[PDB]
Amino acid sequence: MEAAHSKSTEECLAYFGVSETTGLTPDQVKRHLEKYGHNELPAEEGKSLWELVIEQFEDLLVRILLLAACISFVLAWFEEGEETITAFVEPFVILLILIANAIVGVWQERNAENAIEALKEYEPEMGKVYRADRKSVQRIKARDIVPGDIVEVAVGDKVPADIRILSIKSTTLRVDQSILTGESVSVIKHTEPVPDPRAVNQDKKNMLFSGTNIAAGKALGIVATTGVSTEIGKIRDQMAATEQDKTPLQQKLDEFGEQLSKVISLICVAVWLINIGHFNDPVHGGSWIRGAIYYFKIAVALAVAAIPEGLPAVITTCLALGTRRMAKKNAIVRSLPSVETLGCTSVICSDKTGTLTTNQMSVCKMFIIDKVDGDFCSLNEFSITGSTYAPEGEVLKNDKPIRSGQFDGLVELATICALCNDSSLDFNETKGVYEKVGEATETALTTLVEKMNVFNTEVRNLSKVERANACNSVIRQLMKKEFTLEFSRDRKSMSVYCSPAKSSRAAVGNKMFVKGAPEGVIDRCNYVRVGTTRVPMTGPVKEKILSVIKEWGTGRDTLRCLALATRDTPPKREEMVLDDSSRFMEYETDLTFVGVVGMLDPPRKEVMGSIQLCRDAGIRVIMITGDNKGTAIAICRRIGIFGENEEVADRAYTGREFDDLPLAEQREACRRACCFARVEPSHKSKIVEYLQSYDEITAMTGDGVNDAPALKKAEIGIAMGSGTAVAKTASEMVLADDNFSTIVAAVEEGRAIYNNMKQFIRYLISSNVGEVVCIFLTAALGLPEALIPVQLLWVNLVTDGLPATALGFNPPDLDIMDRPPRSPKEPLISGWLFFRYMAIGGYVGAATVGAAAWWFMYAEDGPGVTYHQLTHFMQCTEDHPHFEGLDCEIFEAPEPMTMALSVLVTIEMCNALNSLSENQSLMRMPPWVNIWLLGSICLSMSLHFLILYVDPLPMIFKLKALDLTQWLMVLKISLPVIGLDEILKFIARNYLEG
Ligand SMILES: Nc1ncnc2c1ncn2[C@@H]1O[C@H](COP(=O)(O)OP(=O)(O)OP(=O)(O)O)[C@H]2OC3(O[C@H]21)C([N+](=O)[O-])=CC(=[N+]([O-])O)C=C3[N+](=O)[O-]
Ligand SMILES: CCCc1c([C@H]2CCCCN2CCN2CCOCC2)[nH]c2cc(OC(F)(F)F)ccc12
Ligand SMILES: [K+]
């Protein structure tokens, strides 16, 4: 029964066929249980350890690597590992990384928090029901509660199901619906049906929501829905459908890895098409075991060269360093891959109060009717100092610090503020000054009561402890508060009913004190107030009253206005049904206006400029607030979303206006709208979806467990450092200080991260493209293996992974925020940018080929047989008498291999600086700028020399030391690569445009 808020209390018991006196029979429980299931959100079907391991080994690139150790292992048992006990190491190291990477891939998951599981806190364990089999109440398990059940609740209890209320066995009933919205004010419940069947939850004044707490009182009710059909259950199935996509970089890497696989195979087929010349060999003689191993030893070597094997830890470190870096900037990033998407944001939907504004309201202006004499009108406009909730401040009539008690209309304006108020103050000594006790809007009134000191009470000898509750108190002493007609949104006002103290300071019976939205209250006003006199509400005064209201609420003051009024002859107390909010507006009719108060939720200091940063960075900002559209647009002009004289008729909509549009014109609104006023949580997801339909990367704020669906649906769900736990666990970022400028500061660091990830991603992929060249030459020309895979692994992790994890520390750009947001479908490599690194990749491939083959065909220690094409290594059998002018076994040697591995290191430390800018030269950008990078290049060398000396390592790598002079033909070959890209860089600087 999902419509139970619009049915009469008798209509619901009729629908279920239950007696409020009996409850469900045991047979009725049986049937309703099978029809509706149990009262629980579905137990999530998570993953296990056995599945996680397969996830780590389903990835293409780890699959290609996994195969590359099932071939290196074959070539270890089938290769004489007795002459070289360093043989079984090549297959063993490969597995050791797929194992370590798999281990990293899972402790990234045990800690990962599910946002849906955080909803299951608001599942209480127990609940009280009444059924047929027993006359007393039964505290049964909450999951066993079924719709149609008669259920009891009281203070402290957590509501276990969506409940329609039947009888409120207390003088009042109050509910803490803060988990839903994030608010902090208990709401009064009634029992009359709510007419609108399609009405929102804040208007379901007769419903009890599963998961919310009972603030006051005790009441009985019938259960409308259970499980996933509840209001919070309706939200779980909204996240369970949310397909959060991969970050753009993830799609680039997925597309790169998809292309890197098809590219590796492209070369493997090419090699067999070069040694399709070995297809014309005799059947005898040539050991096919020697030929097949050569191809397989080349294949396990080929795959290692292509895959950036340090990049998974290079990235997941660069991100984690910005994570700690942002935590000092108050940005708490929860999802590591989101530090990249955080910089691609183009739309930022931010709630107004708390983040854009300080949520510290205080009244700035107020006025009374001064004179009504014919069409002539006179207002008594005042102004108030003070921005905190402190009684420090004073009233100023044309800057005369006036004594407020002098004006009689000000004393009535103050009694309304103190009495028609469910908020107060209190001495705060935990932190030194004052703090709001209630609602921000109502507390601003009680503070106004203090600054006025309307009765000139003691002001000199006031201890700043019993302060702030002083002029309020002396007003509560006069009129006794009988009951309150709470604020509802149909009539947009609240009221209190008061009798006097009945002593010598009595009055004309009782009084009603009304406050609310100006238009509604003013319409119900049939009289005014001139000090203590009273006049019929006339046409001019209404126009003059409302004119100032628009000046105050629409002008550059951007004030929230409240029209205060009192009913002088209210109905007799016995004639008011206080169980029907629909009859409250009738009770608040025939009023007399007394004044209007104007308060300001002031914008934050850093907010004013952060909007302009978004303008410079091409980021559209959308405000979302509960202010009326007239004042919403007013605050947007104040912070810079709009220009003070700019038409925005089709660029700012309310909740009612947005739905009256057909789905087509809704999509076009979000493309242009920069402000929404008085929306429903159902619109935060609709706006995200429409902003997504324009391929726009959207940031969205939120606080409640009903902002959670939009937080999930958004590319970057942003939560509050004070929001409910569910909103945080459903977010990719938490503002530790509830501030908007934190978002802009986070978007800045996200670009500084990527703009440097741009380099090392291109720079490691350039070295891999370079190593693959070195293998292909050692394969076509059939040279002795110039780089064994065990050496290539050390390079692609350590001797390269420290320069790569330093380019992240590059100097941030100055125009870093003067450039528009980066596009998602921006391709990995440009046509030029690909060609550039192919030329560099081709060079470094033909230099390790040098050192590990120039150690022949022009060497001192090596053969140096430059005339005779050596090439054939294990091909030589007895073809060496006088054909090979010496021996036949130093083809394989840890002396040429240690020469290529040596030059590659020095070569890749050079490229670690060409990837410091991108187009500008080193004549302009010297290596003096990244000293973090410099002091690390030495370390990889000291490790390179550590594998060229220390006890076991040289044998492990099939490398031996160089000479104090053999570095001659290392730098003679390596260092030229700096000028190579510097040549390619002058192409773009002075002779290329876009
Ligand atoms: N359909 C609507 N009709 C009228 N008002 C709406 C409507 N929808 C929202 N609001 C108003 O907006 C204020 C809350 O919205 P806003 O300040 O933007 O955000 P929130 O406080 O809700 O918390 P959060 O945004 O999650 O951090 C409320 O204070 C008040 O009336 C409410 C309020 N209230 O009970 O909600 C009581 C009140 N008095 O005097 O009793 C004065 C308000 N006011 O002046 O704005
Ligand atoms: C980063 C370069 C590409 C690359 C991928 C791609 C291929 C397309 C599908 C998505 N993955 C990225 C997901 N992986 C899962 C395993 O943990 C690291 C992240 N998977 C690699 C594995 C590597 O193994 C190794 F151990 F060598 F790091 C190396 C590079 C890649
Ligand atoms: K999300």
mmCIF file of N, CA and C and ligand atoms in Angstrom, residues 181 183 353 439 441-442 487 489 492 494 515 560 562 625-627 678 703, ligand 1:
data_model
loop_
_atom_site.group_PDB
_atom_site.id
_atom_site.type_symbol
_atom_site.label_atom_id
_atom_site.label_comp_id
_atom_site.label_asym_id
_atom_site.label_seq_id
_atom_site.Cartn_x
_atom_site.Cartn_y
_atom_site.Cartn_z
ATOM 1 N N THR A 181 17.308 13.944 5.316
ATOM 2 C CA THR A 181 17.661 15.254 4.785
ATOM 3 C C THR A 181 18.971 15.817 5.316
ATOM 4 N N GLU A 183 18.915 17.503 8.239
ATOM 5 C CA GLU A 183 18.470 18.642 9.032
ATOM 6 C C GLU A 183 18.619 18.332 10.523
ATOM 7 N N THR A 353 23.155 26.742 0.979
ATOM 8 C CA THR A 353 23.399 26.920 2.402
ATOM 9 C C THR A 353 24.447 25.934 2.931
ATOM 10 N N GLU A 439 16.785 26.355 14.788
ATOM 11 C CA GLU A 439 16.896 26.581 13.356
ATOM 12 C C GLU A 439 17.611 27.901 13.090
ATOM 13 N N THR A 441 17.079 30.165 10.858
ATOM 14 C CA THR A 441 16.181 31.292 10.619
ATOM 15 C C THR A 441 15.518 31.757 11.911
ATOM 16 N N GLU A 442 15.073 30.819 12.748
ATOM 17 C CA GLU A 442 14.417 31.207 13.992
ATOM 18 C C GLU A 442 15.416 31.713 15.025
ATOM 19 N N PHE A 487 5.036 25.312 11.183
ATOM 20 C CA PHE A 487 5.179 25.742 9.801
ATOM 21 C C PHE A 487 4.870 24.578 8.871
ATOM 22 N N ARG A 489 4.119 24.018 4.468
ATOM 23 C CA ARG A 489 4.516 24.702 3.245
ATOM 24 C C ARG A 489 3.346 25.063 2.345
ATOM 25 N N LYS A 492 2.851 28.353 4.281
ATOM 26 C CA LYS A 492 4.147 29.016 4.440
ATOM 27 C C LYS A 492 4.167 29.956 5.645
ATOM 28 N N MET A 494 3.947 29.847 10.382
ATOM 29 C CA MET A 494 3.709 29.199 11.663
ATOM 30 C C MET A 494 3.082 30.210 12.612
ATOM 31 N N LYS A 515 4.118 34.241 11.857
ATOM 32 C CA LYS A 515 5.259 34.608 11.034
ATOM 33 C C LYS A 515 5.346 33.631 9.871
ATOM 34 N N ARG A 560 16.349 37.501 3.065
ATOM 35 C CA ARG A 560 15.180 36.666 3.295
ATOM 36 C C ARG A 560 14.207 37.443 4.173
ATOM 37 N N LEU A 562 10.549 37.973 6.263
ATOM 38 C CA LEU A 562 9.482 37.327 7.018
ATOM 39 C C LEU A 562 8.491 38.392 7.452
ATOM 40 N N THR A 625 19.215 25.901 -4.178
ATOM 41 C CA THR A 625 18.827 26.489 -2.905
ATOM 42 C C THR A 625 17.335 26.295 -2.676
ATOM 43 N N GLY A 626 16.914 26.572 -1.445
ATOM 44 C CA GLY A 626 15.519 26.608 -1.073
ATOM 45 C C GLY A 626 14.929 27.996 -0.995
ATOM 46 N N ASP A 627 15.723 29.031 -1.250
ATOM 47 C CA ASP A 627 15.190 30.380 -1.335
ATOM 48 C C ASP A 627 14.221 30.483 -2.509
ATOM 49 N N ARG A 678 14.288 25.617 -4.857
ATOM 50 C CA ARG A 678 13.199 24.853 -4.247
ATOM 51 C C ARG A 678 12.894 23.591 -5.053
ATOM 52 N N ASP A 703 23.823 15.776 0.961
ATOM 53 C CA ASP A 703 23.954 15.618 2.406
ATOM 54 C C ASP A 703 23.153 14.435 2.945
HETATM 55 N N1 LIG B 1 7.997 24.541 -1.006
HETATM 56 C C1 LIG B 1 8.470 25.411 -0.093
HETATM 57 N N2 LIG B 1 7.599 26.445 0.382
HETATM 58 C C2 LIG B 1 8.094 27.315 1.315
HETATM 59 N N3 LIG B 1 9.381 27.182 1.772
HETATM 60 C C3 LIG B 1 10.282 26.197 1.357
HETATM 61 C C4 LIG B 1 9.823 25.291 0.407
HETATM 62 N N4 LIG B 1 10.791 24.415 0.119
HETATM 63 C C5 LIG B 1 11.796 24.789 0.868
HETATM 64 N N5 LIG B 1 11.570 25.883 1.655
HETATM 65 C C6 LIG B 1 12.268 26.742 2.693
HETATM 66 O O1 LIG B 1 13.667 26.773 2.827
HETATM 67 C C7 LIG B 1 14.408 26.669 4.125
HETATM 68 C C8 LIG B 1 15.381 25.396 3.899
HETATM 69 O O2 LIG B 1 15.973 25.445 2.576
HETATM 70 P P1 LIG B 1 17.576 25.845 2.317
HETATM 71 O O3 LIG B 1 18.001 26.937 3.392
HETATM 72 O O4 LIG B 1 17.948 26.202 0.889
HETATM 73 O O5 LIG B 1 18.192 24.376 2.661
HETATM 74 P P2 LIG B 1 18.114 23.361 4.040
HETATM 75 O O6 LIG B 1 17.978 24.170 5.156
HETATM 76 O O7 LIG B 1 16.901 22.643 3.863
HETATM 77 O O8 LIG B 1 19.397 22.193 4.553
HETATM 78 P P3 LIG B 1 20.646 21.603 3.458
HETATM 79 O O9 LIG B 1 20.410 22.367 2.076
HETATM 80 O O10 LIG B 1 20.475 20.042 3.158
HETATM 81 O O11 LIG B 1 22.003 21.818 3.934
HETATM 82 C C9 LIG B 1 13.262 26.490 4.994
HETATM 83 O O12 LIG B 1 13.131 27.444 6.085
HETATM 84 C C10 LIG B 1 11.674 27.904 5.964
HETATM 85 O O13 LIG B 1 10.902 27.374 4.741
HETATM 86 C C11 LIG B 1 11.904 26.486 4.179
HETATM 87 C C12 LIG B 1 10.900 27.157 7.097
HETATM 88 N N6 LIG B 1 10.754 25.699 7.178
HETATM 89 O O14 LIG B 1 10.134 25.178 8.093
HETATM 90 O O15 LIG B 1 11.199 24.893 6.414
HETATM 91 C C13 LIG B 1 10.274 27.879 8.138
HETATM 92 C C14 LIG B 1 10.232 29.261 8.339
HETATM 93 N N7 LIG B 1 9.598 29.854 9.380
HETATM 94 O O16 LIG B 1 9.528 31.056 9.603
HETATM 95 O O17 LIG B 1 9.019 29.198 10.220
HETATM 96 C C15 LIG B 1 10.916 30.040 7.349
HETATM 97 C C16 LIG B 1 11.655 29.470 6.146
HETATM 98 N N8 LIG B 1 12.274 30.497 5.282
HETATM 99 O O18 LIG B 1 12.158 31.702 5.577
HETATM 100 O O19 LIG B 1 12.899 30.314 4.291
#
